Symmetry: D2
Subunit: 335 residues, 4 copies
């Protein structure tokens, strides 16, 4: 044996889309706020990140999060998100994960009915309530950012062969792009979606050319990751079926929280029911998140809502990672 | 927490291509020989296999092996190989892994100069010597089956667009199919090889139509997995660069032992040097196995050799897997 | 870090009395029968045993075992028993411990009413039935080796303090000497643990040499390795309570299954309590086992009683032991 | 299995005297200073402490701590100290243990010559320098809180056996009473451990109430929690050797860093050995620390000596503790 570095992680997964929750192995992250804690994980580390997210440990579509100290006084703990493509600001599919594992293990004391836990993340402080049935977690509701519709219609080039036929854009903590499948020859099944991953990611690059828009107020994103394909379900519980291409060139096995916390803008104002409804929203894997509007914050420009999205995480093993200072691929090797 | 089942694995990787080595969690596997031990893992289990190899735990190109009891008296232990596509009979990339981890941990006493360990596997008893430098393993030489060339030239249909231009076939513990890249528009880099994985796997199905051949003596394989693309290296240490498409629809991140233990038939008889030479043979990842002929067993039909292939495995964390009897994806979920 | 060997274990406890269960730390261990499996420990290793049982890992007292392969038909797995002082032939609280974990971790599939496990002492094949209440284990009934009275009364020696006279000695999977707490004048409280330990192993020694001591079968035995003190109870739920001094000078925190299976074996032959009757045997700590007499049987000399004893184990953490080949105390300390 | 909470730990030992280091079992623990971090343990939890230190997990003796966040500038991380009896302010062998592991596991990056770690007692910020020899740690120099003589001579009481007279008492990060082994008539061998433990905590109690006992700073202290027996050595490499009775009635297997940092503090003021001079202080077990006097300093009453002590820790396995919410002894047993 050998090892140099040894990192303690809990494997989760939430409706597919895995989440590696680093619990021990880095005891303190200097930063005052979780935003600069993150910056201090960027540089300095970001190779714990690569070691864990890239092969031979991780894989293309792999994800995870570090539980750290709070510094913020409200209670609980701090988290930072991370994936094959760097560090994400907020990642529902993972706020679920973190919350589930925090209660399931002793890291927070479980209430019994529903445990409220508020984690820090480099984004705004995040609010999850954990439905627990006497013994165990059943599912988690995470309340998302004020999300909104951006500019209805719009469409660019698209190669082979149509030319043709319009799309849409909206927020959800991050931007997105909406396609009704008909755009061409997609089917969104385990069987293929090799054409989907490639014809989806190429748009992320194509737009980024223009129709650039910073969210009115604050200044980070500028433009585009986080596209989306949708059309008609296969789980009868649901409505629609869709998936999301993002970060380096991955697909989401989960319906995508930040996804559903977007385009739920269309549910109001664009017709389709109005407020405090059901929405049950499922991915390629054939597993479903529940989305609901809640408050409906108009705000001066546009019209917005503060959504509540419910998913469920299950622990998939406990990990003692160790990095061979001889292993040529000791950190992240990719494809 | 919960859990029902809990399985102890050591994560390895050998020149990419990961290997999950299940050490504890199933104490006895009934079978007299490792072949029926394997059969008894097939049925009965083969969902430890799916849980570990499929998502959210494993991934498309994931691999591993169970260390079990010997029953055979020679010494050491028994192993069974397994991957996303069932159970492989022999898997160099993994005989390396197993041997490396067996010595690196206390499971076999390390010699110091080079530890000889002979593992069982459901295939023939396998022979690895482990170069160890005072403290640690450096690399492992695994001596392979009598391998051979099968029928020079040959070619079938191939769609889009050439029609055109010939291939070849040979053994290596398992069959294979050899393509000189020129066949069309391949480049064999991390950048793409989406066209390579798809245009490679489609041949595995296309042939299987005819030119069927059982290895003369014994009766298992009949026909085809385990194709191969090759042409000119990028690591100057090497010669050629190539990769292998196999099992369900994966690529090998390793050069492929069973690969190199084949087509080293061409090195003799077909020209190219003769016997007890160097061959250094590298994959897409840009990492290299060393292959050498050794004995050269003619055998009545055809001409064969008993090769020695050297690779190196590094431990990439220790795993305590646990399966949620609520988790809908408690066993293997795929794409 | 550099570690040389690494052993994977499960921390159990059964009515106190910890049990370290080694799972897949070493892959195969040869000896045909579990007796010569034990010899193939002992003569080799027995410094896994010291490393684990002695400080700084274990402590004086501290107990545990290894799950291995069977070789023997019908048995689900092997099992050996080990402690600070060496190796015991059979351990009630240990067999409870093994069976509980075997079901609890899913090493064997759980029947739901009562899960029937056969382990391989070595003393002899033992049948444990694991009461599981839909979800989890409730208690384990272990039916022990044919137990018997040996010698009747028997005579003693003087050192500390004064001569004194009668006692008795008996088999119960391991051999025993039973004292009323009058003969020596203690009373079985934590207050006096130390005088019991010291005068306990002083008798264990100075009845040995000396006495005839043999089991008509086995023909490895001829050693009374445990001394048993008893007196009337404290908890009214229980009858007469004991503590057992053995291996180097350690007490049992459990009532000692092999101990009680020996006591109620002297009874029945002694008169008192006459088959299928309740026995509730308590330790020092306050923890109780439930014994009952079953199928009588004889052994090639004298009529025996083939008892059953019921206790309850709990898992108390999972352990990845590693030994630094620099650490001066890499193996068993002592004190 | 169902477990409620799960704590991740690293088993260490430093010249005997085990240390259980809790790493990322609980994510954030609030108290501004490490003193009120300790209070926020103690008052809350302190049954993680019992679960870990008491049987069946720990034992009488047995020691450990929690790595936490800093809050305090310049310090690499937090650290608290805990044992069977409660919480200590500062632990030499424990600070050795923490620093060794912190470097060994890569929790902090290793400098190569001498790796400088600042931990947060709470007693006060301590500086440890980890001698690492290219590959691995060789030894840790921990420079301790300003230590001093307190009271000079001082008077005693009679119970078991007879009155007797003089001794002395001193600070060394924790408060102490030092006895020549004449006053009480022992000799520090394993033979008599038990009489030392029992008469040790009997003095620890019956000097307390009674005496003045206070550190001019801190103003949480006013408790002499450790009694120190000393007499001339056995190993000629060492000078006078000791053992320390504390927390509930446990001995130290190490020479006790906080103990020696208190002894050579009475010395220098006593005459004898006059700064930057060798001190080799041995325990009972046979293990030795190296103490030396440094930068003098005073404390708001009396002149102090600010000592350094050097020992060596080794990792003795990694621990995933889990507590069954059924297990009657889920938390600390006792005996
Ligand atoms: O739904 C989300 O929050 C998310 C982030 C990245 C992929 N999905
Ligand atoms: O090289 C090998 O042995 C192998 C088996 C499957 C993929 N590679
Ligand atoms: O419970 C038992 O069988 C046992 C043996 C030694 C200590 N306890
Ligand atoms: O080494 C020490 O500092 C210590 C404190 C208690 C036991 N040992």
């Amino acid at each position: 044996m050998k090892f140099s570095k040894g990192i303690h992680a809990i494997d989760s997964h939430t409706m597919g889309e895995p989440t590696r929750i680093v619990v021990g192995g880095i005891p303190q992250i200097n930063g005052e706020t979780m935003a600069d804690k993150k910056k201090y994980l960027e540089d300095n580390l970001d190779y714990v990140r690569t070691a864990l997210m890239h092969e031979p440990r991780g894989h293309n579509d792999m994800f995870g999060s570090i539980i750290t100290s709070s510094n913020n006084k409200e209670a609980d703990f701090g988290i930072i998100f991370m994936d094959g493509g760097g560090y994400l600001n907020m990642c529902g599919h993972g706020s679920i994960g973190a919350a589930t594992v925090a209660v399931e293990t002793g890291m927070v004391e479980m209430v019994e009915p529903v445990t409220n836990i508020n984690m820090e993340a480099p984004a705004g402080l995040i609010k999850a309530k954990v439905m627990v049935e006497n013994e165990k977690v059943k599912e988690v509701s995470i309340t998302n950012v004020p999300s909104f519709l951006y500019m209805e219609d719009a469409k660019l080039e698209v190669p082979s062969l149509n030319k043709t036929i319009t799309f849409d854009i909206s927020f959800g903590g991050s931007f997105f792009a909406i396609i009704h499948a008909k755009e061409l020859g997609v089917k969104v099944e385990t069987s293929q979606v090799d054409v989907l991953k490639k014809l989806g990611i190429e748009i992320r690059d194509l737009i980024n050319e223009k129709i650039k828009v910073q969210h009115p107020e604050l200044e980070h994103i500028k433009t585009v990751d986080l596209v989306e394909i949708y059309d008609e379900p296969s789980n009868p519980e649901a409505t629609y079926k869709n998936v999301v291409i993002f970060g380096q060139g991955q697909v989401d096995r989960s319906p995508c929280g930040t996804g559903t916390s977007a385009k739920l803008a269309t549910l109001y104002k664009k017709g389709h029911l109005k407020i405090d409804e059901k929405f049950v929203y499922e991915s390629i894997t054939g597993t479903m998140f529940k989305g609901r509007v809640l408050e409906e914050t108009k705000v001066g420009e546009f019209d917005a809502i503060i959504p509540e999205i419910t998913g469920g995480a299950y622990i998939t093993g406990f990990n003692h990672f160790v990095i061979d200072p001889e292993d040529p691929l000791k950190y992240g090797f990719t494809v």
